[PDB]
Amino acid sequence: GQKVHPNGIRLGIVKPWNSTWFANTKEFADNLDSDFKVRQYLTKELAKASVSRIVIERPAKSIRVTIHTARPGIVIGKKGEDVEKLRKVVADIAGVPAQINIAEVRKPELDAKLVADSITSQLERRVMFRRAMKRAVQNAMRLGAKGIKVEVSGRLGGAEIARTEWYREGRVPLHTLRADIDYNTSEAHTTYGVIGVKVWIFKGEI
Amino acid sequence: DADKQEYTGARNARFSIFPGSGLFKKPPKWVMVAELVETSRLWGRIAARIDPEWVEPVAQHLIKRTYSEPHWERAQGAVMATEKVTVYGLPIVAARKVNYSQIDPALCRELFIRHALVEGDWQTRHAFFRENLKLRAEVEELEHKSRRRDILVDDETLFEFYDQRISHDVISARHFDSWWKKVSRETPDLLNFEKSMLIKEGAEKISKLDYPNFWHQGNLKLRLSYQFEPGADADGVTVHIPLPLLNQVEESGFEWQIPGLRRELVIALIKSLPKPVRRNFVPAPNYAEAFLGRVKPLELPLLDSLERELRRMTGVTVDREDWHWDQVPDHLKITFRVVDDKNKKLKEGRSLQDLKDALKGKVQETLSAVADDGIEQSGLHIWSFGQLPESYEQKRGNYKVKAWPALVDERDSVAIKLFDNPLEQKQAMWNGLRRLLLLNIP
Amino acid sequence: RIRIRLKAFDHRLIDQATAEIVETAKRTGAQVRGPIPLPTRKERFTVLISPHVNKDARDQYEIRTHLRLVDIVEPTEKTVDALMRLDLAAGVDVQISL
RNA sequence: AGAACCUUACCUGGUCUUGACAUCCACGGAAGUUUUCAGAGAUGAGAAUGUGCCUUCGGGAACCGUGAGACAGGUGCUGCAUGGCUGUCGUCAGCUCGUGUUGUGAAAUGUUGGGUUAAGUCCCGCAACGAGCGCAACCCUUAUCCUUUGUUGCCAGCGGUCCGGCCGGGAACUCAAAGGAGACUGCCAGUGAUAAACUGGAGGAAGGUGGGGAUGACGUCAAGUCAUCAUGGCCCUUACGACCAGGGCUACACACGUGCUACAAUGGCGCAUACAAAGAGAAGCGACCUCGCGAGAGCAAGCGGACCUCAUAAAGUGCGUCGUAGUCCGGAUUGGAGUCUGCAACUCGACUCCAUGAAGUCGGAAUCGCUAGUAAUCGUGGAUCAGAAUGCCACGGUGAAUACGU
């Protein structure tokens, strides 16, 4: 492993940060601790809702989180029911009252993290990896993407020895910083170990 | 429960209809039962559908009322809240909009007395309300003249001013109407505000000659309005212009402004100069004073005046293009709005040509509306006009309306149309005269 | 007479944050000093990136604290009511000193 | 990126067994505070007081304590079962695909050829035509100018000066940080396939990827990490889990790796005195004054910090002396007396003072870095951290030699 994280090289230029707030030397550490603590709860609770992305900002002893998800109905609940259950629990974890914004992700299979966690699901559902992967990669081209890289790695399909497999069609310029890349990883906890899953997505020049 | 065959009863308990009922298969949204029995689960034996407008009147000792979202609504002049009525924790009315101001008298007195009297955004007929609104107006144009917002006393003092003589019976708008009904007969002038708005600031010196309300340009007189809102599109001293006066107005000498701004005006103009020229003039307020102590308005154009007296002071030849007007603030630029007889501001700018390059068709039809006799004729082929007018004149209201008639060539005939410029009149009448001569020579 | 310190992690965000404050302050009472660009603090961070070995392989990170100062000198006691209502975004911290 | 215990995963001894840590059940008490006794330590026993909420009058929530079973736990093995992350060749310039053509086929062609560049960089040619990853560009910083603003930053044009930007004052200038501009072989001359391009010249603060950093392709080494974490399999389940105390990770006939300080007169020593950048600070930095030779201690201002503090930069320059003496070099080592930190400084911190003064008089075979603000040297700060660097990370000051050439 020698490449650099594309989102981590592209934070200050193109891709915005996931948390946006300020602190001194005192409150910064346990602020990060609470930011961690709410995130895994939201992910395990709404893992069936196809959560893509989480934004934290902290308005003056308050918190507003915005979660980008692809499916409206499950995360909103019927007749506005579940988001108020999510309301009080994150305030309980924070110690301050909170606000939750549900952000729709249209064009769902162009998001990297949703593609990654989707293709994680079928490997743990033991359908065969080649068909799963080429189905996951041609779909972005069909709905009009202009870069896609996909990888899985490690004890692949019950193999005794690990291997890596990558597909890529289009144009995925990692070394161009102005290129905009959607990137987040995933892990499949299959019966033989951990499949690693990586997805790079390329949208535009600026 | 929605799409569920279970019922929320008293406290957090849940039950279901005893299956021997006929409405066991036809569940109501609101049920009453006779016997609660715990056998496999909780069962109400004899069940019947009810309408939930029933249970508030018959459980007055049991209803708990929760009022949320207390917001002051203007239209009633009163605070609304959403009430929820419950017994044993059962939400009988999920939401009902009700008058929080009629519910409690403590805070709503302060809220109403502040809102409809101190801010005073009230749709009503009250005479003291009218006069206090006009007093706050005549103070806010004073602040707009001053460009300093310390003249007016704070609104909390106005709240105290109201509160000390509004009796304690007033809690809402209806009580206030009832109170003004019995108090307006004894003291009408008590609620009208006294003249103590300006106290000790020193701005309240404001000179009327330094801040005029009308500008005289030649024979004409143009309206002035004042506004303090820095960075706004309508900010700055705004001249209001009747539309037919456009043919007599010219931009010359107009940037002289009211005399109350000229010091910081010439400071802005002199610091619009680049750094080498700007270094000659230190300090800028002192040199502004030395300029204003010798300059008189309207004797020269503005740029020429700054150039020649600044040359007199230090000997630099500041060129015309050295002065930058984008660096000059917009509120110092005198806003232009063309208005009608009913003060509808049609078009606007901060230079006169922004008006003129957009109003020529509208000024033309304005001339045509007043010219109701047919000097303007078409299909004309032989000179049969007698003495063609040099400068056509009419009168509307208090102002004369001037234009210039001329011939117009049409390639098939000659026509007469109006023009708002003597030069365009000249070339138009020239071309029409040429076509007329060509038609008349054999 | 009032010192408004703005501390943020993005210059692209703190410019409009101080611009909103300055135009709202001059909107209702004027005589505001310009937003002073005051020397930012750079926190440089050296991290060993491999889990077990190769000390000489590291990454470098930094925190930039964009620091602006706004000064108002004259008594402007009516602006302060709407000044607390400007509900700026979470990206910048504001400190008001008298 | 910091072992006195703790860390600690090791040893020995005392100790526990649904457990030190999670979730489910049941019972009782809210929680918590003070005191004493034995023990190296984890127990047992008192006194005080709990008892807030929540009206559906009850309970609920937190917490403690007790017991059963489902269960937990492991820095235990496998990096040759894995993910993730990382080194490496190597910042090397190459690594491929779609379609076509040739060859039965493995494969080739594109990617070879002439030039040319740092570069499959570009041009031309060409059974190839295109495309992708790579290169470069855009990322950051530094090198010059302009616009904006000018606090705590600056002091030129003004005065008063308490001589101190001290003040009034001023926004010029430095500077500060935002937005622009500026360097693109852009222009000229020659060479060169009328090419790409090269050499030289002007202009310019910067001229030929301006300089430095980020950026590491396809992949190699079954490379390193099961002890960062997650993780499949296997192992223990009264012990390979858990608590505590003392010792060990710091030993010592030796051998090597990487550094520090020296062997000195381009120096040592003493005095006077000149010039920075960068960074940190609230359980913190810690002014001044006093006391002590000093380590520091008291007192205690200001500072969440362009203001205040760490904080006197040192080489230097000028004086006086030393005089080639294992020395007025060097400082290891050792004894005593002390200072701070922390429950605690014996093993096993850091520093001061007094006294001593090892080897060492330029390093065999060999071997390393360095192409310019570099090498060498001189100091400074940071992280970790209660206390702890000659290590790392960053910063400035002085500041080189040489490159014929393959």
Side-chain angles (χ1 to χ4, degrees):
Chain A
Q2 58 265 24
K3 300 158 183 50
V4 67
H5 205 291
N7 182 259
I9 200 59
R10 266 181 202 81
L11 294 174
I13 301 299
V14 174
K15 213 59 65 183
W17 292 272
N18 304 307
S19 62
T20 61
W21 48 267
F22 173 94
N24 196 16
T25 68
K26 280 269 173 65
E27 190 276 331
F28 182 76
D30 62 358
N31 201 296
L32 290 172
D33 194 74
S34 53
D35 291 331
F36 180 45
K37 280 185 176 297
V38 288
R39 263 159 184 276
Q40 89 270 20
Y41 155 78
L42 301 153
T43 61
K44 65 181 182 293
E45 177 60 284
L46 277 297
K48 215 72 161 183
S50 70
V51 172
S52 168
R53 192 255 197 275
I54 297 169
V55 191
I56 294 91
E57 61 295 340
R58 292 220 173 182
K61 303 297 297 308
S62 169
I63 285 177
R64 314 155 282 200
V65 298
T66 301
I67 68 184
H68 283 47
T69 78
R71 158 54 202 280
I74 301 299
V75 63
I76 63 170
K78 301 276 212 304
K79 294 178 180 292
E81 182 65 26
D82 292 323
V83 64
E84 311 76 340
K85 273 77 172 178
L86 282 71
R87 272 210 169 294
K88 304 164 310 312
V89 297
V90 298
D92 291 331
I93 300 159
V96 298
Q99 183 62 255
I100 297 89
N101 309 349
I102 302 299
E104 181 65 26
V105 186
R106 264 289 311 125
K107 275 312 201 153
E109 62 268 14
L110 294 174
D111 171 74
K113 182 55 162 145
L114 174 59
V115 163
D117 295 326
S118 68
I119 206 59
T120 284
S121 73
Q122 293 83 18
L123 271 73
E124 301 215 60
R125 290 177 67 250
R126 73 181 76 186
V127 66
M128 184 278 287
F129 64 95
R130 207 69 81 180
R131 305 164 168 208
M133 185 61 72
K134 84 191 61 73
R135 183 181 295 275
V137 65
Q138 65 90 22
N139 217 330
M141 294 298 103
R142 190 173 51 80
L143 280 73
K146 67 184 289 186
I148 185 164
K149 185 180 288 293
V150 289
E151 273 179 11
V152 295
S153 67
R155 266 190 156 287
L156 191 153
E160 278 59 32
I161 190 167
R163 56 189 176 181
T164 62
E165 182 62 41
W166 63 270
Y167 290 167
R168 162 162 87 181
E169 293 83 3
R171 183 161 63 105
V172 186
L174 279 294
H175 280 223
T176 288
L177 302 103
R178 285 182 277 166
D180 61 357
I181 293 320
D182 198 14
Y183 181 76
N184 194 358
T185 63
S186 170
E187 314 165 337
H189 283 48
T190 183
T191 55
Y192 303 71
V194 184
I195 295 286
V197 172
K198 285 192 211 283
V199 185
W200 291 258
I201 293 300
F202 165 74
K203 300 325 306 171
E205 67 92 19
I206 203 169
Chain B
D1 213 10
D3 294 346
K4 171 197 280 300
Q5 315 303 322
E6 195 80 344
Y7 290 165
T8 315
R11 186 178 290 171
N12 212 36
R14 313 190 49 79
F15 69 101
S16 56
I17 291 185
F18 182 76
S21 299
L23 73 165
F24 164 65
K25 191 48 164 68
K26 214 280 187 176
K29 67 185 181 320
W30 271 78
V31 66
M32 56 85 89
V33 294
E35 199 171 321
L36 273 297
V37 174
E38 192 37 47
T39 44
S40 173
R41 66 162 58 81
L42 211 60
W43 301 91
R45 176 165 152 77
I46 309 295
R49 176 177 172 180
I50 55 170
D51 195 359
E53 59 91 17
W54 276 23
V55 53
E56 294 83 3
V58 301
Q60 287 300 309
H61 309 161
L62 195 65
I63 46 173
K64 185 84 42 163
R65 312 163 169 203
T66 318
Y67 308 96
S68 71
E69 308 169 42
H71 85 94
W72 180 86
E73 200 170 290
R74 163 74 272 165
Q76 312 310 311
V79 183
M80 302 306 99
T82 292
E83 63 188 3
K84 182 261 287 181
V85 174
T86 185
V87 298
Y88 297 118
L90 284 166
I92 311 162
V93 185
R96 180 62 186 88
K97 319 173 301 310
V98 73
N99 210 328
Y100 190 74
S101 166
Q102 300 309 294
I103 289 153
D104 63 346
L107 59 92
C108 312
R109 164 176 183 89
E110 272 69 23
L111 280 182
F112 160 74
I113 286 295
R114 210 173 289 284
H115 296 145
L117 300 187
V118 192
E119 292 83 3
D121 49 287
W122 203 1
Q123 56 281 11
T124 187
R125 332 298 165 204
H126 294 89
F128 70 96
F129 178 82
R130 184 51 55 222
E131 189 47 85
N132 277 2
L133 190 143
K134 304 314 292 148
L135 283 165
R136 185 178 295 113
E138 302 330 291
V139 169
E140 66 183 1
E141 292 84 4
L142 276 178
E143 292 205 333
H144 294 168
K145 296 265 181 145
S146 71
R147 314 311 211 101
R148 302 165 282 279
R149 314 286 283 289
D150 62 358
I151 298 170
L152 172 51
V153 74
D154 46 296
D155 291 331
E156 185 89 337
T157 60
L158 315 172
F159 173 81
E160 284 256 2
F161 168 86
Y162 276 117
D163 183 47
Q164 292 178 358
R165 323 177 309 270
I166 302 302
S167 185
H168 301 74
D169 62 358
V170 176
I171 62 170
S172 88
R174 300 276 79 76
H175 298 82
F176 182 76
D177 176 62
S178 297
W179 174 93
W180 171 87
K181 274 157 172 161
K182 55 212 192 293
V183 165
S184 51
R185 300 184 184 92
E186 63 184 1
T187 58
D189 51 359
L190 211 49
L191 300 181
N192 300 263
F193 190 40
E194 273 80 61
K195 314 306 150 283
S196 191
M197 298 73 57
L198 56 91
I199 57 171
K200 278 200 54 48
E201 274 55 46
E204 76 274 9
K205 180 260 174 193
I206 297 169
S207 175
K208 172 59 200 74
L209 61 83
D210 284 334
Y211 299 83
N213 193 26
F214 297 100
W215 200 248
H216 295 83
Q217 189 271 296
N219 55 314
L220 308 181
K221 193 174 148 191
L222 280 299
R223 196 223 298 268
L224 286 164
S225 49
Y226 288 66
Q227 177 169 343
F228 182 76
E229 188 174 42
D233 201 66
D235 200 37
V237 185
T238 299
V239 181
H240 299 185
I241 297 89
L243 183 63
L245 272 74
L246 181 141
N247 293 349
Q248 285 156 103
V249 298
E250 64 266 11
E251 207 174 8
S252 62
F254 210 93
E255 285 86 21
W256 260 113
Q257 190 86 248
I258 71 184
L261 304 177
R262 296 185 183 140
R263 213 190 92 78
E264 65 183 1
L265 277 170
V266 303
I267 280 161
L269 272 295
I270 191 167
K271 77 175 181 284
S272 69
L273 296 186
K275 292 184 159 26
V277 190
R278 207 166 72 210
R279 183 89 149 148
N280 292 108
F281 294 99
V282 166
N286 180 272
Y287 270 77
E289 181 294 333
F291 174 77
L292 64 92
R294 289 175 219 117
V295 71
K296 303 312 151 273
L298 294 174
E299 72 202 346
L300 311 161
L302 277 296
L303 279 299
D304 189 359
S305 296
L306 276 296
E307 285 178 10
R308 45 181 301 280
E309 283 87 5
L310 266 60
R311 185 266 182 275
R312 288 174 67 255
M313 281 324 316
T314 186
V316 298
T317 310
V318 177
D319 302 347
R320 188 53 49 108
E321 62 276 0
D322 299 335
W323 313 87
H324 301 104
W325 286 68
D326 291 331
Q327 281 177 343
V328 173
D330 283 88
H331 65 279
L332 307 182
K333 325 201 92 172
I334 310 162
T335 313
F336 293 99
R337 266 80 180 273
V338 298
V339 307
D340 58 357
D341 302 307
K342 293 192 179 182
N343 211 14
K344 188 168 185 172
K345 306 181 287 184
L346 297 173
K347 291 173 201 53
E348 57 261 17
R350 270 177 170 75
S351 63
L352 191 142
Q353 314 313 315
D354 310 325
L355 318 178
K356 276 211 176 187
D357 302 349
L359 286 155
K360 287 312 169 76
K362 301 224 161 182
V363 166
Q364 172 184 336
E365 63 183 356
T366 310
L367 297 164
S368 305
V370 194
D372 74 272
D373 307 326
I375 291 177
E376 293 179 353
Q377 303 181 23
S378 60
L380 301 167
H381 52 57
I382 301 300
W383 170 270
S384 304
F385 308 139
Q387 194 164 344
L388 184 67
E390 306 87 355
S391 85
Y392 176 72
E393 195 171 297
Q394 282 281 346
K395 154 82 82 173
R396 182 211 286 206
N398 53 59
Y399 50 86
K400 307 274 194 156
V401 190
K402 188 176 180 180
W404 287 276
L407 299 152
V408 176
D409 180 22
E410 296 287 337
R411 176 68 273 172
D412 303 330
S413 64
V414 191
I416 295 164
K417 302 184 192 183
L418 268 184
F419 302 93
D420 61 299
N421 217 308
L423 184 64
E424 265 81 1
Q425 180 213 25
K426 283 156 185 184
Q427 288 89 19
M429 214 169 72
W430 283 352
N431 192 11
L433 168 68
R434 292 179 189 184
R435 191 69 68 230
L436 180 63
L437 286 154
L438 278 179
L439 289 159
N440 282 47
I441 299 157
Chain C
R1 94 191 200 101
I2 62 170
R3 304 140 85 82
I4 301 95
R5 309 250 302 186
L6 288 89
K7 297 179 94 163
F9 286 148
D10 179 31
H11 65 279
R12 184 178 293 172
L13 271 163
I14 197 166
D15 58 68
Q16 63 84 30
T18 188
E20 183 51 39
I21 281 160
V22 173
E23 62 86 20
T24 302
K26 72 169 70 173
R27 157 75 197 90
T28 59
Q31 317 311 310
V32 60
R33 297 292 89 192
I36 314 298
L38 169 46
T40 65
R41 220 171 163 275
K42 325 184 302 295
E43 296 68 350
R44 61 187 70 188
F45 291 158
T46 65
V47 59
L48 268 49
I49 62 172
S50 179
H52 187 34
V53 297
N54 304 109
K55 170 188 270 193
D56 287 22
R58 303 199 211 206
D59 291 24
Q60 299 277 39
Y61 303 125
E62 62 186 19
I63 280 300
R64 277 317 193 82
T65 62
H66 311 276
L67 182 62
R68 329 302 294 281
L69 168 61
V70 168
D71 209 2
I72 284 181
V73 65
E74 76 292 340
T76 310
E77 303 297 329
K78 145 192 71 183
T79 299
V80 184
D81 193 23
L83 190 69
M84 314 284 96
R85 303 326 189 162
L86 279 168
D87 66 5
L88 53 85
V92 62
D93 186 74
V94 57
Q95 172 98 61
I96 306 170
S97 285
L98 308 186

